[PDB]
Symmetry: C2
Subunit: 277 residues, 2 copies
């Protein structure tokens, strides 16, 4: 089910069939100031049966950071970059508002007590966890970050803004969607990132692992990256590593960064891609 | 393209690889005998159309005039009032009206909520979308959302087709919608066609060529009692896709009326009955 396999397939597709954007996108390369151009494809999907962790081996993926951001969003449910800073992460400071938050985005949405459960207002994460055990057959296991009533109050809108869970035959399946995704930098980080969430949720609810589905709306690549991306497609692919999660954790809110450990993560080498600002 | 071919493919997929929910206590029941209405399903299904044909089912008839009427009520009128739908000669939503005659804060109510700031004025999801398609094409945020997290409990009923994403690339306007769950026998044919029409209405009033139409389904299923007829329908003779005519003179989204729509040469199979699940 290798991520390398499907990644390569999409990337190759975008290169030989992508649609170029130039009065469209203004993205000066933070390096020489020149404009960044993309090639994009619409509606792509990668499916994994969870027989292995979906992660890249042709290029190293920052697994630890993926999990720290994940926890900050889903567990702590905060929009405060400070909390994330205390976790040793600084990749969100560029969106830090006056109060240190990112407006009413990401974690803020997950923490709003807007669902009436047993006479009390509960948030999206709580409601879900409860309904996954006490109402598996439901066709409405949905988390939504794209709140239309507050899009203006968000220092930044989410790429991966939704997920739908399904309990089919004792198995927990997860489907997430990214409205936009940078295949070179953002994608690998996000695919692995949400698989961990599935594995976390499945453990605390007591379900076996179902299928993992990642949907991308606007699938794009920066032209400057194409050369390396083509080099990456020739790099050797190894067997997926093993992800260890503390089997003793039974409460979602009890997972810590220490409870996760990737085991035997063999990868390609350094091949960094420039970031466009 | 051809809705019939892709539809049959999903239906057959369900029949052969579906997973039932027979061991669960389901909220759905048969209106006839009250017994639990079980489904058989597949997860994550997508149907893509290049718009060289209007995606419509020919193996049985699709209630196209109601599809469009419903569309106008939700999108154009942005109404949650069932009485407005009644005046259009539709009574299928009557079962869902609360005392106030509205279906709560669902569908049209979300689309008509003035929540986006635009030129020092608050607009709704539809106005904002229309402006942005012309003024800010290429944005990766051309998204409408019916699934409002804050409003979920104040909705008489939760939407199946709850979102859309539009893509303007080289003049062509592309549309991708998503249904969280879709009953393949009764709701799907209706919903798919319905959204294609919305693509055409918008592409006409924004002056874009028709791009791809993509329909994604989360929980793709069929109710167990519908399998024998679905089996029949699959063996039926398919017909050439009809032609949809939309008044070429309408330049504004809100100027459309049901009369501006007319299907020409719509040939289809005989009546197939399907028990209603509640």
């Amino acid at each position: 089910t290798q991520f390398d396999k499907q990644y390569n397939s999409i990337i190759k597709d975008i290169i030989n069939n992508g649609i170029s954007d130039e009065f469209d996108v203004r993205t000066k390369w933070d390096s020489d100031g020149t404009p960044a151009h993309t090639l994009s494809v619409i509606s792509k999907q990668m499916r994994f049966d969870n027989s292995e962790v979906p992660i890249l081996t042709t290029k190293k993926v920052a697994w630890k950071t993926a999990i720290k951001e994940l926890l900050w969003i889903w567990q702590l449910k905060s929009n405060d970059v400070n909390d994330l800073n205390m976790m040793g992460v600084h990749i969100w400071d560029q969106w830090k508002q006056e109060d240190g938050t990112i407006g009413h985005a990401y974690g803020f949405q997950l923490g709003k007590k807007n669902r009436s459960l047993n006479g009390e207002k509960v948030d999206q994460v709580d409601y879900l966890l409860h309904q996954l055990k006490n109402n598996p057959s439901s066709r409405r296991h949905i988390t939504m970050l794209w709140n239309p009533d507050e899009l203006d109050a968000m220092a930044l809108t989410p790429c991966v803004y939704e997920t739908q869970w399904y309990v089919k035959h004792g198995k927990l399946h997860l489907e997430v969607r990214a409205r936009s995704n940078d295949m070179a930098l953002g994608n690998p980080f996000n695919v692995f990132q949400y698989n961990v969430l599935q594995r976390m949720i499945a453990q605390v609810t007591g379900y076996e692992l179902g299928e993992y589905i990642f949907n991308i709306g606007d699938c794009h690549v920066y032209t400057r990256h194409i050369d390396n991306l083509k080099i990456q497609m020739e790099r050797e692919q190894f067997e997926a590593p093993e992800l260890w999660i503390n089997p003793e954790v039974k409460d979602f809110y009890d997972f810590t960064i220490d409870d996760f450990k990737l085991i035997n993560y063999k990868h390609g080498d350094k091949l960094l891609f420039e970031v466009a600002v």
